[PDB]
Design a protein around this nucleic acid. Structure first.
Lengths: 103, 100, 65, 234, 54, 63, 100, 435
RNA sequence: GCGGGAAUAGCUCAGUUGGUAGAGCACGACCUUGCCAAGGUCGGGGUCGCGAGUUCGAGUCUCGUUUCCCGCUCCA
RNA sequence: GCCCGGAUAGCUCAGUCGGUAGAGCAGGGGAUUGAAAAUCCCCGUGUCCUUGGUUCGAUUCCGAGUCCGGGCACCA
RNA sequence: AAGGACGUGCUAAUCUGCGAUAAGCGUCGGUAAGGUGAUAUGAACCGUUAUAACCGGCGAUUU
RNA sequence: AAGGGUUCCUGUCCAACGUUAAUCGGGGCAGGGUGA
RNA sequence: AGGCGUGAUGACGAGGCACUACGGUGCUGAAGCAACAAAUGCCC
RNA sequence: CUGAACAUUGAGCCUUGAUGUGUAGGAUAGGUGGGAGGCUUUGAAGUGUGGACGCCAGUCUGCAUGGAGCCGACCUUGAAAUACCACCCUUUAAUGUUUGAUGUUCUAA
């Protein structure tokens, strides 16, 4: 099914990054997403279209898996699928991870 | 140095070392000889500064240089093909001996 | 005589502007099309300059014969 | 063989001659080929449809004719000279063992009726092979009016003419003299045509009365018309 | 043709917009503030001078 | 796509595609290829739109 | 009509840059990349009906592409045709030719 | 970009600088009225403003009104520019000397220390020349000082004294405020112009008349001219063709990336003025001479032109259009940027360097310069058409716009060229740990 | 050194389980003819290469030997 | 180099049952003739190629040896 | 037709897909909050739950 | 001509490729070019 | 086939006159006929 | 696939004539049945021709003359005996033929 949104809340299941959260900037067609501030690596960047534009070792978002992150519900960090079991003529999301029944 | 060069052109065009039009013509009034008005001015330039709290600019002008690596060969010359040869060599024998 | 008197002071006055100009001001006070020391701060040096502007008006009246 | 003499010549010159005429016309012609003033053997050559010759598909037998042959009736006995029905119930001229055997089989005889008795007939068929034109040999049936050999020899002494087959199936039987009369001839002819019909050999091919020819000696002959079942319908 | 050739080139050439021009406008206002100022003080100083020498 | 095709009418659509191709794509593709009006997004449209009109004609003789 | 819009689909890019393509537009002729149409008559009638350019001799020449000598499979640039269309009137100053 | 200016205004640092500047301009206006012991600033200021016919316009453009409406001295900024020029000769000769100058912090100190010494020698020579000259042509000078032994002695000394004072003045201001300093003086000149003009708009007001119509048109006009000059100037024809292909891949394709545009679709404000000054100048030189009694013949030729294409307006106008067009086409010389581009390596995209690259590069510049020529004329025309129904103007017409533009563009360019860097650095240091 | 051939009338030349073993010419005697040819008749002769073995019987079959002859060692 | 054969009274040659060697042509003599050819008869000279051996006796049997004639590889 | 040749994109080689209506087009449905296949992902843009894109039936075009 | 198929020319770059070195070349890089 | 009119009062042309940024361009122009000797080619 | 007439010629039943000679039989034995006998008046025979053999002394008969009567020795040998009357095949002739051969002529395949 799915667990993706373009604003999704996570509690982060990635080690060294647990207990953190962030919007999902963009969803990638690689099973990956970009969560705020936790995929930052220092990147030896060489200017391209080279101008004033800074080189240095710049903080640059990588991307981690969606299965190596876990959702945040609304009071709990539990993840065990989000229900798409209800059809209003189209599948609608709700929590069944902690059963708080909201998208 | 670039700025000075602009200054020089402005001065030159004065064709009188700046304003130095002798008094007379029709209006009276003693004559002067002036300073050297003008400006200077800048021009591509430099600037930028992602500052502004609510704004953002870019650049303009420059160049580049890449020499990267071209590597392949020789490696990319022994796998992308094959120089097989059967080596055709004939060794005509020599008989005629009488072993009877 | 009036015209002479201003002049003596003016020359003393100049020496003073320069003295001010080098320390706070930057040793580029005159024409230098860059800059690198004033703007940050309030100093002594602004006042010498202020004086100079003011001074020019003073000189003629006095001088006036 | 055949003579140039007038009575012989006219038939002899013709190819496919001896053609069939009614019995009265036949006998009327036959008389006139000669002048009566001598004996001459009148024969019948009755032609059976068998083409069987010198074989055991010959028809041979013997019938009692109510009259004599053309040279006056004389008898010579083929015997074994220790007979039982040819030397003891009909007798013979002499009891010859082969004193009489020779005479039959010799072919020069002054006896007309060649009597046969056993000398072998259970191993000799109806065969014409190296038998005599004048002589003969017992055959499986020697009679055709008696189906007994013993009684046949009896019959032969009474006055039986023993007749046997040819190349063309010809049963030659001496009918009489020329000094016979038309009717005396008729009686004999009838005795022989009826005899062949009565019985025949069953060790041979059948009978059937084809051409009946009648001839006298020195002249030729002409033949009598036949239906082949009766000489009294044709 | 010579004037025109120059025009014909202009119409393509004009690019690299100053959608910025509101900055230039904002600067114009700042340039204006100054003018107002020279005139005011000139009346104050001039006034002091008018009593002494006028 | 949807409503575009559906509101087309034979007489109309015929003369509309002439405009599409010539003097709305004809100019564009030449300018763009020399960098004098190269905007890549405009190339993607027009091309995949003039196509549509011709479809209806050979399918069912216009909408 | 004399021709359809698909016989006026014949130009997809001009040639207006570098040697013998700026030089041979200023001094003589005009030059444009003419798809791969394989016609000369309809290219004359292209610049009649569209534009308003008048021409002299129209010259047709096949261009067989040029190598890309780094492989992968076949490589090489695609075929096209170059045509010297040749002005007789117009005298166009680039990105003009007519259109009403 | 708009967003960018606005931000600065909020922060403390700018506000202090902006405040200072309004003060700075004032200091200059005040100074101008009150005289000089050497020539006499107030008398000089008036005369210049008046009329003068042909003579006034030529003098006025180059000046910008700077001290042609606000006259004081007869030396100051010119010695700084002269001195600055000698150092430029010195820099060229010796590479090492140039290097220090380029680095901004080092560079600035050097220039003044050298300039003050130079300026003093130089100035005495200029002053003596100026002093002899000034009395002779009218007969008379000043009214705090009058021609004679006394005027010569005072004049030399006074120009020199002034020159040094100004140099220090100019420096305090640049850092304290925004916009170069040399620029400020020029700017005051624009200000000096303004009341006569202002008085006339005030009179018109609203009333639903011709006068109402004109106010609305004038307000609009000032802005429009400003906008139109601006749009063209940035106006860039921007061709980016990457040199070779260099296989494919990386981004959309990794080629040697050459992005060249240096195009300015206008001709540039300093060039524009130049063409205009030059036509005027032979006549203007004559006119004074003629009056004195000297070079009578030179004046007579100037007068002759009026029987063809008449009116004082008509000769100048026609000539000025041709001249803008002419100047630009021929030469690429009095526009620095044009010269610089050519010298450094480059090649036109699609073209193989040789005769063909040289040809093409010149051609763009020849168009560009012609383009500029056209635009300047169009601004000037709009008043000329407008005025005949509306009312005659007198400060909202044509050779003034050119005067107004050069001072601004440059003042503005400088505030950016320091100002962006300054903020960036300031921000940066604090993050590091550094005041 | 090997393999196959023969030694028979003066001469040239048959035969042969081993039975009384032959021709043509020369030679002996005749005849035609003066006499010889040519022509014509009529005779003789054999250690049957030599010695044994086989046997009543050898030259041969069998075995040894003397003399006279051929064909081979191409091939290796 | 090897195997074979011949070596005769003047010239040319026969000569095995080893035991006393003859034939022819020259040549001489007699017969024939008128005298001769031819043809017939008679004549002796070989100490039967040297040297040993077997033998009572060998030219003739055996072993060498000579001179001459026969047949056979310089080298692959 | 199978199978090819040559084209075809935002541009550039090939690969992939597709044919001058050319990495698609229409129509009906499924599906959908993210997408514009790949080497090399960039550039420009598009859609955002309901009109893109993706998937299928049917049709068009199919050099 | 046949045949090759851009190898031509132009500017560049030199790791591999020309029997060497190699700034150079018909190599790499990309352009321009054959007009009836 | 080849020669002579005409095409052509033109082009081309030895060599000179100018300036240049040293890439190169502008300025000008004499004679232009006669005779003899040729090919495996041409008439063929 | 491929026919018609007519000409010529072996052989089978046959039909009508003339020899049918082995050995023995004097001579006339294809053969098979009748059979010791023919004088019928241009008629067999006899006298002469051809065919049969001359093997023990002979006669037969085609066919002409001829109204003009002979000889199997009315033997006997053998497997069978002769004239003559039916009548056979060969050698041969003519007919009816049946069949296999070739030829000739023709046109319809």
């Amino acid at each position: 099914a799915a667990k993706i949104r373009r604003d999704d809340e996570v509690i982060v299941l990635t080690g060294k990054d647990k207990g953190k959260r962030g919007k999902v900037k963009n969803v990638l067609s690689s099973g990956k997403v970009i969560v705020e501030g936790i995929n930052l690596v220092k990147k030896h960047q060489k200017p391209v279209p080279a101008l004033n534009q800074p080189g240095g070792i710049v903080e640059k978002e990588a991307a981690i898996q969606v299965s190596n992150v876990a959702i945040f519900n609304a009071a709990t960090g539990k993840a065990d699928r989000v229900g798409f079991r209800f059809e209003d003529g189209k599948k609608v999301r709700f929590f069944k991870s902690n059963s708080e029944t909201i998208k | 140095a670039k700025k000075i060069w602009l200054a020089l052109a402005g001065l030159v065009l004065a064709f009188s070392a700046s304003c130095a039009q002798y008094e007379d013509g029709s209006s009276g009034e003693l004559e002067r000889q002036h300073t050297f008005a003008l400006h200077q001015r800048s021009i591509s330039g430099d600037g930028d500064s992602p500052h502004s709290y609510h704004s953002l600019p870019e650049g303009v002008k420059m160049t580049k240089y890449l020499q990267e690596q071209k590597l392949a060969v020789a490696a990319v010359a022994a796998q992308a093909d094959l120089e097989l040869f059967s080596t055709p060599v004939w060794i005509s024998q020599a008989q005629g001996i009488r072993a009877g | 005589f009036l015209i002479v008197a201003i002049g003596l002071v003016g020359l003393i006055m100049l020496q003073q502007g320069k003295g001010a100009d080098m320390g706070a001001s930057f040793g580029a006070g005159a024409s230098a099309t860059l800059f690198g020391s004033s703007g940050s701060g309030n100093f002594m040096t602004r006042m010498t300059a202020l004086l100079a502007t003011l001074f020019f008006i003073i000189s003629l009246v006095l001088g006036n014969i | 063989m055949a003579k140039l003499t007038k009575r012989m010549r006219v038939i002899r010159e013709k190819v496919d001659a001896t053609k069939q005429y009614d019995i009265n016309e036949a006998i009327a012609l036959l008389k006139e080929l000669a002048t009566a003033k001598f004996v001459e053997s009148v024969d019948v050559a009755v032609n059976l449809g068998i083409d069987a010759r010198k074989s055991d598909q010959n028809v041979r037998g013997a019938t009692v004719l109510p009259h004599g042959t053309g040279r006056s009736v004389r008898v010579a006995v083929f015997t074994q000279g220790a007979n039982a029905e040819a030397a003891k119930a009909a007798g013979a001229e002499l009891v010859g063992m082969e004193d009489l055997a020779d005479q039959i089989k010799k072919g020069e005889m002054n006896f007309d009726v060649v009597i046969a008795s056993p000398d072998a007939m259970r191993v000799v068929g109806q065969l014409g092979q190296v038998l005599g034109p004048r002589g003969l040999m017992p055959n499986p049936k020697v009679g055709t009016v008696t189906p007994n050999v013993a009684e046949a020899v009896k019959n032969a002494k009474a006055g039986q003419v023993r007749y046997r087959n040819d190349k063309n199936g010809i049963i030659h039987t001496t009918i009489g003299k020329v000094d016979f009369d038309a009717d005396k001839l008729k009686e004999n002819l009838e005795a022989l045509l009826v005899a062949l019909k009565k019985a025949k050999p069953t060790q041979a091919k059948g009978v059937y009365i084809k051409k009946v020819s009648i001839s006298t000696t020195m002249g030729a002959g002409v033949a009598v018309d036949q239906a082949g079942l009766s000489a009294s319908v044709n | 043709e010579a004037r025109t050739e120059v025009r014909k080139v202009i119409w393509p050439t004009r690019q690299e917009t100053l959608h910025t021009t509101l900055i230039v406008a904002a600067v114009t206002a700042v340039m204006s503030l100054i003018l107002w100022g020279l005139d005011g003080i000139l009346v104050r100083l001039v006034s002091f001078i008018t009593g002494l020498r006028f | 796509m949807k409503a575009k095709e559906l509101r087309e009418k034979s007489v109309e659509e015929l003369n509309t595609e002439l405009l599409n191709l010539l003097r709305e794509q004809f100019n564009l593709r030449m300018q763009a290829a020399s960098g004098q009006l190269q905007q890549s997004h405009l190339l993607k449209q027009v091309r995949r739109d003039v196509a549509r009109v011709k479809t209806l004609l050979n399918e069912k003789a216009g909408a | 009509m004399i021709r359809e819009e698909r016989l006026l689909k014949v130009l997809r890019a001009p040639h207006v840059s570098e040697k013998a393509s700026t030089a041979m537009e200023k001094s003589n002729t005009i030059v444009l990349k003419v798809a791969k149409d394989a016609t000369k008559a309809e290219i004359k009638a292209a610049v009649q009906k569209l534009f308003e350019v008048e021409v002299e001799v129209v010259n047709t020449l096949v261009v067989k592409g040029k190598v890309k000598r780094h492989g992968q499979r076949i490589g090489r640039r695609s075929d096209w045709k170059k045509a010297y269309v040749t002005l007789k009137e117009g005298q166009n100053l680039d990105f003009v030719g007519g259109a009403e | 970009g708009l967003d960018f200016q606005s931000a600065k205004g909020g922060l403390g640092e700018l506000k202090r600088r902006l405040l200072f500047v309004i003060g700075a301009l004032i200091v200059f206006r005040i100074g101008s009225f009150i005289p000089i012991p050497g020539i006499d600033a107030a008398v000089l200021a008036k005369l210049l403003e008046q009329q003068r016919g042909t003579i006034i316009e030529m003098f006025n453009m180059f000046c910008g009104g700077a001290l042609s409406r606000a006259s004081i001295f007869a030396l100051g900024i010119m010695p700084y520019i002269s001195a600055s020029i000698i150092i430029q000769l010195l820099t060229v000769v010796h590479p090492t000397l140039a290097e220090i100058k380029k680095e901004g912090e080092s560079g600035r100190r050097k220039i003044s220390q050298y300039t003050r010494y130079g300026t003093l020698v130089l100035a005495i020579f200029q002053s003596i020349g100026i002093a002899t000259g000034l009395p002779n042509m009218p007969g008379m000078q000043g009214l705090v000082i009058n021609p004679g032994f006394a005027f010569y002695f005072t004049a030399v000394v006074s120009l020199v004294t002034g020159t040094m004072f100004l140099m220090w003045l100019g420096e305090q201001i640049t850092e304290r405020g925004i916009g170069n300093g040399i620029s400020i003086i020029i700017f005051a000149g624009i200000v000096a112009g303004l009341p006569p003009a202002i008085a006339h708009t005030i009179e018109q007001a609203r009333q639903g008349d011709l006068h109402f119509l004109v106010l609305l048109l004038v307000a609009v006009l000032v802005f429009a001219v400003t906008f139109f000059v601006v749009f063209v100037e940035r106006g860039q024809r921007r061709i980016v063709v990457n040199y070779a292909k260099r296989q494919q891949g990386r981004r959309v394709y990794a080629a040697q990336s050459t992005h060249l545009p240096l195009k300015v679709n206008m001709a540039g404000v300093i060039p524009a003025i130049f063409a205009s000054s030059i036509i005027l100048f032979p006549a203007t030189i004559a006119s004074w001479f003629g009056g004195g009694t000297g070079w009578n013949w030179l004046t007579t030729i100037s007068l002759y032109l009026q029987p063809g294409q008449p009116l004082y307006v008509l000769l100048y106008a026609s000539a000025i259009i041709f001249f803008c067009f002419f100047y630009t086409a021929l030469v690429f010389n009095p526009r620095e940027t044009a010269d610089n581009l050519k010298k450094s390596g480059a090649f036109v995209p699609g073209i193989r360097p040789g005769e063909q690259t040289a040809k093409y590069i010149d051609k763009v510049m020849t168009r560009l310069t012609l383009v500029g020529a056209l635009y300047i004329t169009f601004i000037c025309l709009i008043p000329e058409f407008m005025r005949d129904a509306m009312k005659v103007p007198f400060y909202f017409g044509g050779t003034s716009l050119l005067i107004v533009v050069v001072v601004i563009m440059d003042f503005m360019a400088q505030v950016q060229t320091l100002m962006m860097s300054s903020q960036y650095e300031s921000a940066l240091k604090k993050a590091n740990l550094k005041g």
